[PDB]
Every structure is written in structure tokens, then in C-alpha cells.
Symmetry: D2
Subunit: 225 residues, 4 copies
Amino acid sequence: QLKSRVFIVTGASSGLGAAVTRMLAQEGATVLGLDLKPPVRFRNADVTNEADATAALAFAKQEFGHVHGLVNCAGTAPGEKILGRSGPHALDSFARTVAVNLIGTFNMIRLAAEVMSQGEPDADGERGVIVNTASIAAFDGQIGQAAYAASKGGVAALTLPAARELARFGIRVVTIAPGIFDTPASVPFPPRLGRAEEYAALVKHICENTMLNGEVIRLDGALRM
Amino acid sequence: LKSRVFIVTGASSGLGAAVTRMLAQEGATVLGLDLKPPVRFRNADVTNEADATAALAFAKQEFGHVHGLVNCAGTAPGEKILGRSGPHALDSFARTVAVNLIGTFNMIRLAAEVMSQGEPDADGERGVIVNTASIAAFDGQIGQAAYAASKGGVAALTLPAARELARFGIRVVTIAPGIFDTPASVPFPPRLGRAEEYAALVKHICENTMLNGEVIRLDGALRM
Amino acid sequence: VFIVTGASSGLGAAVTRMLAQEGATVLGLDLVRFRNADVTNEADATAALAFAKQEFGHVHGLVNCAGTAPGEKILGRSGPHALDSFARTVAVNLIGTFNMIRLAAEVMSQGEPDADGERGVIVNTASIAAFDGQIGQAAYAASKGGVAALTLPAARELARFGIRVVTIAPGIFDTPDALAASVPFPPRLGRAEEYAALVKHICENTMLNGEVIRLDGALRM
Amino acid sequence: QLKSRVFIVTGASSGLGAAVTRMLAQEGATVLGLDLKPPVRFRNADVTNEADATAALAFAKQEFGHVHGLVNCAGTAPGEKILGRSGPHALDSFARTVAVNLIGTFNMIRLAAEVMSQGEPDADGERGVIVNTASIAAFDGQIGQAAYAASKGGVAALTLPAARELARFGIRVVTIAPGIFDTPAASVPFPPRLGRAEEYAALVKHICENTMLNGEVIRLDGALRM
């Protein structure tokens, strides 16, 4: 049960983050939802920014004493071709998508983990769970997804060395790679957009299933782009 | 899962026994198949067409319609391609491939036919097929050619199967387990898996409609 | 000295061509010298490998290109997929290459290492269906998926004797229409010689081991 | 043949880029060697800076007339734990490794590809080949390799969307994931040794010649799993 477990949810104001936050709250969990702007406490923070990350962790210690969970859902999925009519893909645009998607989730990991590390382990020796949001684009990059695919491919790659290291402290790191979700016909089955709640239902299952660790789980109705 | 009819392979022990246990406790009805006795149990050779056919008739008559198939029939033998004795016996590779791959496919093609004829639930779903590969399919070690190749063919089966079966609202998902205690080096949890953990992933797969066509490693982050 | 499986046509025939040009000795096997053999059969394969040892005195290479790539649904108009058809595809594609691997490896076992310590190189033909199985390719995907998974345990064991094991997963080749149009680049069918060319890159580059290499023009089915 | 073809190579001063530049020179190719420090024409460039990268492409457009080939070999490979004795992994250190390994290769790719774009197709219809250098850590990330692994995982994941877009113009994009090489061992199954940079170069060459190789990541690692 997640009851009285303290989770940090990133991208918490909408989409996958909102749905995870909601799921945790229904399970009696305690949540710090973090996002750039406003839609269980909510704080504003740029996950990319060191000082904002630090201050949200300091808010967590001070309000709650412990952190047992981190769910990285802050994310941007722009579309932009490597060679546009206009000229080449903006460099800034690519660096920014990498900064939000990859650097931000790493930033939340290095700092959340420091804290989970200090808490009481459970019966299995578990101290913490970290879940990240990659995307199916990490494996099936479509035209115009270069930045996005590279970004989420970095997240997907990060899972295993993070799992191997944090195993020491009994912290799990698992990554979900979602397909198309109804968030702010092609799909073999079910032939429809994923509902955020289905994403959250997998998140909770990772939280509960101690043997899931170091893996990237495709959640995509068998879609291949 | 309550009042749903599931067929489970390798049901007399290990993963399959834990899956039958999980299902029954969820109020589902289970036809557990295995070669030898340990919810009804019936003897069957998952490999044999006629035998698999008869098992599916028993289920059609007896319980009426089939919702679920969990392939947990397998063998995990170990044999060098080149031994002091000589090269790896051919019979032996073929038997491992018969039980793991050919037996899984057989159970899929016949369970699928029956699910095909059933009525779709609230999401349009007519059945779920969960397959047991192995982390050997990606991390084969010395000694594991037969098992690795055999489980690797089950893994690759997943997607063409889900793609076709989508037509009928049948999902196909494969799990790739690591080391489970069935009949030290693991990163975390630094222990063998309990079979019950495998059954709980299967149950989550049953519950989560968006899981389809995927191979899910369940192995405490172990790379062999 | 090379044994090439499925050497009568397709990719096997181009592989025999390429080694023939390179001035190697080839034993072509199929249902430079040919020899009629069933890759599946424990006897034919032994007799084949015994042929090769007395007639040739060593074995340095094995290229498995014996294959069937047939099409059939899991639920057909008529009924379920035939079990024997499925078993037969697994047999040719997977049992047959394993049969050839266990035997050729026994011989390459007993030969002289070169300057890199290499006694042998085995190249297997998987397929992209092993990762992108399209509807109707369950048997094909399953068996070629078996091949692909074999590569690493096999390379890890055979490392002992300096035998490398590499698998190629080709996309669409003109071997025995605009499906071609759908391959991103080059937008055509692959030529068997290009396949043979990678077999050659692999025989040449000692660091390629234990890998499945896509040769598919960026195609995803 | 690589004869008369013009290549840009990145991290050209040592290790893998050096050996690539060597093999291209020996096959009679014109080579633009980019790197930060010196040991075919060499220029000093930061593959990460937009203006350095634009200045290198203009240079090679004016100087040689075309660009047919980009080989990305610039890269760093720090090890730092997520949670170290001192404290958590520095933020900016992680960014910096992502910036050299990932933002760097993308910068070169977007700019080279623009130029390759503007040339004539060769006999196979090919205007370019881009080979990237990822690493086995993209799939087998070891302890301490988080930043390196994510970086290279980025590079690996880029390859298919790039080949898919750039197919339109006949530019192939292929990524090699090398294992342990002798660049600035009883563990590798066979050969039980560090790879020589020449063997990396030889795969780069195989890729330039083989038109069917596109959108893929090739492990070049002697079957090592980290």
C-alpha cells in the first residue's frame, strides 16, 4: 500500500503527472506535485533548475520528513524536422527539449535519491521507488521527432545504470515508455488514445512489484510508429 | 477477473501454480494444464495438437467460453554446444524448442480461436494471452543456447501475434522473468523472485488494457 | 575454407559467389562444390562435416542462409494456423542452423588460430521480422527470433576456442511491386551481393562478435 | 570507393576520430578534421558551438565544394556516481557530458546534412553518410556511467528518426556502439583485448560502402556485456 508513503510527482499540473498525483492521493499517499505553474501540496519549480530542485527537496524534508517515491512526468514533445523549409532545426530548440526531458529528470533523481537513501527500508529492504517517463519515440523515432526521441532515449538508457547504483540503498528505478495518450485509430488494440489513468495504474504496479527494476516498459497498445 | 475462464499451462508447479493460485483467489475459474498432476487440473501435452484440441473442448463444454491464457509451460535445461562428450545433442535442442516455443504457439492458436467467438468486454476485449519467455532470450549465458533460442522465439512471437489478434480484441503480452525460486548477484531485491510476484505482474497485465505486444523484463535489474 | 548453407540460390548463392571471388574454398549445402544435404537432419549434417574434413582438412567459416519465409495467419479463413507448418518453419530456420553450428564448431575447434587467436566465424541469417513481425509472419518471426537470441550465448561459449558468432537481420531482398517503395533509403529491394558484402565485412573485422546487425535500409515493418 | 569524397570528422585529434581520419586519408578522401586541440586539413572547433559549426561547414563548402560524409567521434566519458561520498552528482557536470556527446553530434548533423542536401546524388542515389559514435554503455550502462550512458543512449535513439527524415535526400544515418577500445579486457569474450582504433575505422568504412546499412546501431564490442 502507498498509504502514508511520500511521493514527489513532476509535471504534476496536468496530463500523466496529474493522473499519477490523483492515483497516489486515492491510495492515501502523501504527494508533493511539482510543475512550472499551477493546475497533497503543489509547489512551482523548474525541474531543470538546480536551486528550484533543491528548494522543493528542502520543502519535502521540512513538511513531510521523508521521501519514498519520485515520478518524473515533466516533459515536452515538440515536432521539428532536421531540415525544415525554413533552414535547419534550431539548436536551442533541441538543447531545450533535452534539458526538460533528460537533465530535469536526472536532476530530480540525484536529489530525491539522496533523501530516500536516508529513510527506513521495508521488509524487502526497499527504501525508494523512482519511475520515469520515456516514450515509445525512444525506439520508434518518427520524422520530426529527433529532439524528442533523443531526449527520451537518454531517459530510457539512464534507467539501468541508475538501477545498478541505487540498488545499494534499496532504491528501484524503472522507466515507462508510453505510446499515445489523451493528454495535453492506428493503435492495434485498443484502437484509441491511452487514458492517463492507465499510465498511473502501471505506475502503482511498479510501486508494489518489488521485482520490477532497471526495465523500460512499453505501454502502447502494441503501436509501432 | 472474477467469473472469467482462464487456461493456465505448467500449472502443477512454479510460476503456473502461483498463477492458478492468484486467479482462483480473484474469483476466476481455471483450467490448469500440466503433464503430471500437482479450479480443475487436467493432463495434457501442450505440444500435441489433438491433446491441446481436447483440452480446449473440455473447457468449451465445461466452463462455456475462454477469456485467458497463461503459457507457463517450459524447461530451463543447461548444455554446452561443445562438451567433453562432444557437440550438444540435436534431440535435446529440439525438445526444448518443442516445449517452450511450439507448445506455446499451439496454445495460442487454439485459445485464440475460442476467444475469437466470445463477446468483448467494456473495452472491446475478448481475451488476454500472457507468455513466459525468459531474460535468457536477451542475456543468454554459457549453457543456455537451447533455452535462450527457444524463449527468444516466444519473445519475438509477441508482436506479430498482438498485431493480428488486435482484430478480435485479443491482447498478447510476454513476460521475461529473471531468477525465481521455482522448483546473490541480483542488484535489487538481492534475492530470488517469489512466484507470487510473477503472478501479480500477470494480474496487472490482465487489468491494464494498454499493455499489448510488449516483452516485460521482470528480474530485479539483473543482466546475466 | 567455408560451408555455406542454402547455397543453391538467394543469399546463400551470393555468399558462395563472394567467397568464390575472394579465392576461398566453399562447400555449398542445399536440397566451390555442392553437396545435397538437409540442414535439419543429424546424419546429412555429420556426413557433410565429415566430407569437409577429409576433403578439406580444416573449416574456417560457416554461413547459415537456409531459410523459409512463409506466410500464414494465426486465425485463418479456414481455421487456426497448421501446427506442422509452424514446426516445419522453426525446424528449417532454427533447428537447422543450430545443427550446423554445433557441428561446424566442433571442427573449427580443432584448427589453427590465426594471428588474432581466431579459429572460426559463424554468420547466421535472422530477419527483421524477429523485431518487427508483421501479421501473418508468426512462424517466421518466432524462428528468426530464436536465431537472433542464439547469437550471444553461442558467442560467449565459443569465445573459448576463438570462434566468433554474428547474426545479420536482413530486411527485403530480391531473392526468391512497391513494398520496395516503402523502404526509406535506398528505396528498393536489397541486392543479395550487399548482404554478401556484410558477411565479408564480418569475416574481416575481429571485433564484431555476439551482435545481430540489421541490414534493412532503415525499414520498420 | 571513398576516392575524391569529402568527409568531416569530429574529435579528429585522437582515438577513434584520429583513426577514422587516417583510414579516409589512405582511401584517398579529402578530410576536414575538427577538434579542440591539434595532434586532409585540421581546424580547431567546439562541435557544441553553433558558430564554430557553421564556420566549419562554410569552410568545407567554399574549400572543397561538397560534403559527402560526417563521422561524429567527439566525446567524453566521465564516471561519477549519482550519490557520491561527497554528495550527489554535480548537475552541470552531467549537462556538460550531454552537451558534448549529444548536443554536439546533433549540431554537426543538422548542419552537415543541410550541405549534403545541396549536392548531386551518386550512382546509388546517395548524397551523404552520417556515422555516429554512441557506445555500449547506451544499453549496458555500468555504475558511475549515468551521464555517459544517457548521452549515448540519446545518440543511439537519434539514429532512426534522422535516417527516416534524411532518407528523402539520400543521406544515410548509422550509429556504431563501440565497446572497450584502446583510446585515451580479460573481460571481453573474444577477442580478449581492447579493440584497436583501426577496427572502428574499418566498420566506418564498411558502412560508407554498404548502401543497405541505414537507421541502425551496430555494437562493436567482442560480445562484451558490461
